[PDB]
Amino acid sequence: PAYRILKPWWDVFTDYISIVMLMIAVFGGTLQVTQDKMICLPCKWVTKDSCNDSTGPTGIKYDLDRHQYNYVDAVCYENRLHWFAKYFPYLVLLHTLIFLACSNFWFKFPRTSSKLEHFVSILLKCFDSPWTTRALSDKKEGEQAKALFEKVKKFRTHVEEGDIVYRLYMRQTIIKVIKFALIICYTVYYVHNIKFDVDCTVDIESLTGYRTYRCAHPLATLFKILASFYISLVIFYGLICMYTLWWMLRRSLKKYSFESIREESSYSDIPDVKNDFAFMLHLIDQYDPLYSKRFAVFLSEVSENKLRQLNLN
Amino acid sequence: PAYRILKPWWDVFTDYISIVMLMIAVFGGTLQVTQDKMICLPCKWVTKDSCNDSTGPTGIKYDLDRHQYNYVDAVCYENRLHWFAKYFPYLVLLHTLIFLACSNFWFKFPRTSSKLEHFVSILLKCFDSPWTTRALSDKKEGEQAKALFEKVKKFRTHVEEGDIVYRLYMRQTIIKVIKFALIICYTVYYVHNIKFDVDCTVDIESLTGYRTYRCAHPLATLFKILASFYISLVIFYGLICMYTLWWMLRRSLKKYSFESIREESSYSDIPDVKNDFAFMLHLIDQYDPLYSKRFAVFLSEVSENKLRQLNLN
Amino acid sequence: PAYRILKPWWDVFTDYISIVMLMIAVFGGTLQVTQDKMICLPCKWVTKDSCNDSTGPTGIKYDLDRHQYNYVDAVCYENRLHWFAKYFPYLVLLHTLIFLACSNFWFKFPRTSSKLEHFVSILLKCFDSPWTTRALSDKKEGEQAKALFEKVKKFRTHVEEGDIVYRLYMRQTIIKVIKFALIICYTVYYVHNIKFDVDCTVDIESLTGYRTYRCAHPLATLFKILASFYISLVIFYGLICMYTLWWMLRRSLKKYSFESIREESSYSDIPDVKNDFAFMLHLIDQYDPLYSKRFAVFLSEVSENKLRQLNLN
Amino acid sequence: PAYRILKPWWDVFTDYISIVMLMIAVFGGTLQVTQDKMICLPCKWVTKDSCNDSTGPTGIKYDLDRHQYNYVDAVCYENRLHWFAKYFPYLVLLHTLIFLACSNFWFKFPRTSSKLEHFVSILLKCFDSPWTTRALSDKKEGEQAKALFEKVKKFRTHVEEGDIVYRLYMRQTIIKVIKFALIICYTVYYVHNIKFDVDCTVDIESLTGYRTYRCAHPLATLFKILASFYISLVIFYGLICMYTLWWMLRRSLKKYSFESIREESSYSDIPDVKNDFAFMLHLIDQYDPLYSKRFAVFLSEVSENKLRQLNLN
Amino acid sequence: PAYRILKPWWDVFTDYISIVMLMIAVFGGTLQVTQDKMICLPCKWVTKDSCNDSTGPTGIKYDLDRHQYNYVDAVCYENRLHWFAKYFPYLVLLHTLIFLACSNFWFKFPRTSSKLEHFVSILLKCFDSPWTTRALSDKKEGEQAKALFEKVKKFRTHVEEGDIVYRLYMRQTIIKVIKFALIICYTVYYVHNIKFDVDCTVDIESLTGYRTYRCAHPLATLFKILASFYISLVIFYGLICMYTLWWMLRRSLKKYSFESIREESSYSDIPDVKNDFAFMLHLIDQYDPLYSKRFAVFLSEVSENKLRQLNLN
Amino acid sequence: PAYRILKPWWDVFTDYISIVMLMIAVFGGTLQVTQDKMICLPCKWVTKDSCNDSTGPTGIKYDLDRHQYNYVDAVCYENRLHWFAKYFPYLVLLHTLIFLACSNFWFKFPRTSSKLEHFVSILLKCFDSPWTTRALSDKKEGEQAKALFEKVKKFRTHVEEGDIVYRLYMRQTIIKVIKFALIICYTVYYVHNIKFDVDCTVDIESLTGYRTYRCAHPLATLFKILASFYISLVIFYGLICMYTLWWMLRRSLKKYSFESIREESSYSDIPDVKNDFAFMLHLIDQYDPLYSKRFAVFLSEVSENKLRQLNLN
Ligand SMILES: CCCC[C@@]1(C2CCCC2)Cc2cc(OCCCCCCC(=O)O)c(Cl)c(Cl)c2C1=O
């Protein structure tokens, strides 16, 4: 609704990566639903579960109808084919949905959603107050300005003691980094099991007659292309999340200093925000510094004295 | 619209879970419409209604053309296949639309829809009132505030007589819990009955010539995957519903305790709500306490007296 | 628009049942147009136009190619398969469309649509006027109050002589009831006729060589399930329609005795409504009584006297 | 826009019949594009270019491979199948598009579209004035009423010169009637021609060996059902068009005798509208007469007299 | 949004024709990508690379398997089918997109889009200004009308030097006429080259054994139908384009002879617009002359003198 | 939003070329997913692993059933076909997506984004002001204008010291030119490796019997058509990008030469903009010069002085 301003730049690359993951997931899924077949032929000469590889040339007769071929194709497709070759689109679709849910649960949780909406509402009211220009460069605007002043005071009293949003943003990025590490741990290890050629040895003699078969999975090359693209793209995602975790654990976003604003505004009476509002204003500062610049005048008591003097006279 | 206030955190997890149940339901349904076939071959040697399992190898002939393979496939699909393997996506689709209808019958019933929409209008009027900023710490505003006071007084007089919302939410959550209990009661009993290869015996010798057949159901592994995922999802849904039922049966939702804000807001004359209105105030408090903070000053005769003094002056 | 307040609860359950019906209708239609198959085999030994049921086992050779099988499938699909087994989704789609048209013809007809929209506009205007709170408990507001009194008197003179809305809303329900009766009286009679096993005898010897054929319709069980579900759902629809028709012939909706609100408010000089206005006022009372209760003031001559007195002083 | 005022009730039934016509057209079209096959077999014993119909039973061997069957199906489909069976959905698609274009050409033509939009703007402003209440039963309202009076006078002097709206409505309804005559002229004549059993004699002996063939067309019954449904829809559409053409040819909508409303409103100074505005006022009367009731007071010389004396005092 | 008033009547028929060209193009394209095959048979007796047409009837045996038939189908589809039968839908799709680009480049170009936006904004203020009625038949209204007077005066010298809009609207229509010319030269000369019977002699004897084949393209009739429909639609489009070209070369659109308003309105002093603004005046005159009628009072020095005297008094 | 003000004519042609690139990419992609088959036949007589090309004729018998035909089709399609014939739609889709991301990174990056909406906000507010006409031709307008002088002075003091927008808009165009160089370098080099006829000698003798095969790729002509169309589209894209890069490198884009307008606007005290704001002023002047025309009056010292004496007197 009104959360568009509260997203830093690392949550835009995250959004586009997470939507292209979903589109390649549904592409692989509709491919595997569409065909994902296997073509298998029996080997006449066998030497310990291996095809022995033994006027004009003529064809080789196997004495099999089409439906025995279908049966052995299904059986060799299930039993002697790796599980990663079959359900990889479903795995990446599930992981994409878990990434999306982990990204948007912070917004959709009502306990922090209320605080976010309240903060962005008073931020828009602070930005739209015309008295900032007179404070930084008569009466009725005095009453709307004092309405802003005491409701900003009420908000500062209301949200200072909390510790919830910073903890949520800790846990979200922590589980995102851990899940990225697990995905890279298993995917590159199991990606080599997809291959065009596969040999099944099922021991179903009473239905066909032969024992070992030579199969051919035709979608293996395209699935390897999709898997390699997915791995490289989730490396990019993991580096982005690692950088934002390092930034948020390095800048010590619990508390906010406010020296660089008072040094230019020459308002010597300004306090420092303690926690859970300092981090939120750090986030809007990483959006831009000007929105935090115009939030300065609604906290100085000398600005309050100037406002009440202009109201009285 | 503005009904997001009226939903706690346990009623958006329910919605998201219902969406993902509906997606897996429609995916299983379109798969079952798309193929859901099976491949059946006759066993040449039969022992106790089971297949006996008995220079170069050559294929086994059956002297059966393709169309009577199609016939025996259809017959052994319709007769000797367990019905849970066939209609599981339709079953879970039916269950998720029952869950959606139960979760939205609270809002779509007009006798409660009117009460909630008028309550939302009253609360947005109370929240948007500028006089609460003065109250928690000038004639037309006072008259508008007095109109607000009289309208919330008659609204309180109106909705205190009912008891419909609390009992509907009771009879909604309890049937959601019993639906969860029955779903888990039967689907884990029947989930073991889907499998890849199945032996069918349908007694058609006048048409094919053989008696018993060995079949293969190629979608069994993926349907078992989807069924296990659905069972785990139903478990998490049921734990959420049992938690909210325990909360509503423990907290004694009918009455309101309001002294906890009376003692700090210094308005020693506030009443205790009887039923069907204190429950909704508890629900808004479960969203956030601040909307209940701003509703404190609108029900106190000292506050109407202060407004009367201000209107006199 | 805002016509949701103009539909009772027995026209919302109808609106959901009659879209579930369309959903199962389009599902059955796409299934029937997608598969549309039945598999047929010839019986070599025949008795009374039924199949006689007569080293290792070997297949039975009919010496037919695939295209003869296709031809006999088409012939036994049309000539010896019952029409209810084929066009049932189109029948239920037609019934659902006629039900929806009968439900919304009342709204879409302009001669009553004008009365309904101008009615709901004056009720919304009477709801939103601020003088109602003062009257149930400063001259410009009296001017709009006098204008609204005049237009309410104009409405009362305008709509008191008609009967078209009541006549249409009774005729729609009675033809819905008779439609429900027709649907149940043929569908449960013809629902037993679909089955998996069908025998066809079509007299084509000059083309294939055989006389009678044993067939198989694989969609029979799913179509029977859909038909039974449709019958139960139409039964629920008909019960709702019977209830509302009994309500209309019970409560005698032509006139409205308006005693309770006048006794509660002590405005003893109020008249009763003749017809075609009491109907919509009964409907909005079935929505909620407060819209009618706050409509009481704009008809009372003592309320007119108080309005002109407040205009005078 | 808000053109629902400018549509009589017979243009809504038309606008829904044209939708269901489009629906059956697109359904028949997609079914025909999907299958529309026909299965052909050769007759071994032929007399006078017709199939003569001359221990256990055995099949009849033609010694033909599948791809020749496909060739003879294509040939007997393209030559000896009547064109009404093949192109009926495309014909009805073209027809319903011509109905939609003929319905909306009266709106999309700009020379009349400007008059309709400016007319409906004037009627909404005249309907939304509070001065007509006083006219039927303080200075700036008189001034804006005078401005609206001048606009009404300018509109009356402007549109009194034309005839184009009535001319176009003639030219639309008469060609709708002619198109009805043409459709019912040929379609009921040709509808018997589609049928299931179809014979062909295409003179291909050098490629197959046989001369005549017997064929089957498995969609013929469904196409006959769809054609009958389309015929009934055309009949209903044409009855509606005949009724509205007859009504508008007998009412003589060029001029309006305005006597019957001011004989009871007691505003005797009213003229009769000559052309192109009386027809539009009859159209909005067929919507409802109250809109022209509230437009009647804004044209009376005694009404400007009362307005300007109220401006004087 | 409100760009519709700039479009003449011939630019709307052009738009709807371009829509129906697009839908027939996409229908032909989806049909061609769906099937577009042909069925080919070899003929045993050959004369001049054609087939010579030289106890019961028996079929002809060719000893070709299905995959050889598929190969010869592919070869005779690619090498001996005319290119117009294959790429006609994509060709007409390209032509439709070119026509749409030629009709919307006049809007999407910024140097003319800004001028059109300024023209439509100034004409809507001139339509909504209330001083026009008083001129053709209070101090702040006259002052803002003076502001609009000077804005119109500066716009007049802002647009009196250009020619870009007229140049672009000339060039677009003349290249559309050129494109119609090219379309009519090639498509009627090439439309005769599709038919049901096509011969191929492709010289693949080492793989099959036969030399010449006779094929059957089963979509030639429907493609001929679509091509004839497209040809007639193109002819109608071109007649519209020739009409607007003749209108542009005949009516001398560069300057406007504006007197037809001034002898009617007795405003004896008015100038003649020279170029690039009189063209826009013609363009809005083709919509309706009312907008040019109301623009006269915002361009006459006697009208600024009257407003100046009125603001003085 | 209204951000079309920022895109010149070369930035709209680029977007339309990109979207038609995307539709031809997805068309080729869905076609390749849908069929992309290849039909292969063995060659009986072999010379250097190539086909030797050697009463009525009869077919050549290969003694191959359909399933090993499918196997050899898959093997020859995977091993002995160039990868550009198979992954061209995926490649061009990737290039289209990276072009779109490169084009929209200038908007989606927040550090420059915020500067863009702040700049466009002050530009629309300057265009919306009514005092520019008075400047280039009562007192609260003077106060509003003074406030907007303070706002534009704040904008000028803030955004002037940056360079990031100019740096990013250079870096985007340079990599678009680099991508053009790469695409034209490799695509036309590899475009000739798609062909109708392909020979595969894949050494599968113990499964089929033959050694060399002749194949036919039925999509090669359509893929070559699409490739040529894509190359021409890339060429147009690259000429547009090279032109705008040359304009950017040549026209000394960093600083504005504003003195050409102060002689006619008679405000000689206007300075030249240093950097990163003159880029935006060029980028709006490319749209239209009026927005820069009426931007002189809001920054000139004599303009604030004339407003000062207008407020004083
Ligand atoms: C085993 C002896 C058969 C003899 C036969 C003759 C043809 C020239 C030599 C003998 C007839 C026939 C029909 C077929 O269609 C069957 C339809 C299956 C396609 C479904 C999916 C798709 O559409 O792909 C197929 Cl596939 C073949 Cl192979 C053959 C032949 O070989």
Author numbering:
A (entry chain F), B (entry chain A), C (entry chain B), D (entry chain C), E (entry chain D), F (entry chain E): 15 to 68, 92 to 174, 233 to 408
Wording from the paper:
Additional binding interactions for SN-403, SN-406 and SN-407 are also predicted along the channel, due to the longer carbon chains affording additional hydrophobic interactions with side-chain carbons of the R103 residues (purple dashes). As anticipated, SN-403, SN-406, and SN-407 had increased ICl,SWELL inhibitory activity compared to SN-401, with SN-406 and SN-407 having IC50 of 3.1 and 1.6 μM, respectively, and SN-401 IC50 = 3.9 μM. In initial maps using sixfold symmetry, SN-407 density was less apparent than for DCPIB/SN-40131, potentially due to a reduction in SN-407 occupancy that is a consequence of lower compound solubility or the presence of multiple drug poses in different particles. In Pose-2, SN-407 is tilted off the SWELL1 central axis, positioning its cyclopentyl group closer to the hydrophobic cleft between SWELL1 subunits. These data confirm lengthening the carboxylate chain in SN-407 preserves electrostatic interactions with R103 and enables additional contacts between the carboxylate chain and upper hydrophobic moieties in distinct binding poses, consistent with the results of our docking simulations. However, collectively, these molecular docking, cryo-EM, and functional experiments indicate that SN-401 and SWELL1-active congeners (SN-403/406/407) bind to SWELL1-LRRC8 hexamers at both R103 (via carboxylate end) and at the interface between adjacent LRRC8 monomers (via hydrophobic end), to potentially stabilize the closed state of the channel, and thereby inhibit ICl,SWELL activity. Indeed, SN-401/SN-407 cryo-EM data and molecular docking simulations likely reflect the closed state of the SWELL1 homomer.
So, for about a decade, SWELL1 was considered a membrane protein that regulates PI3K-AKT mediated lymphocyte function, and it was not until 2014 that SWELL1/LRRC8a was discovered to also form an essential component of the volume-regulated anion channel (VRAC), forming hetero-hexamers with LRRC8b-e22,23. We previously showed SWELL1 to mediate insulin-PI3K-AKT signaling in adipocytes, skeletal muscle, and endothelium via non-conductive signaling mechanisms. Also, we and others showed SWELL1-LRRC8 channel activity (conductive signaling) in the pancreatic β-cell is required for normal insulin secretion.
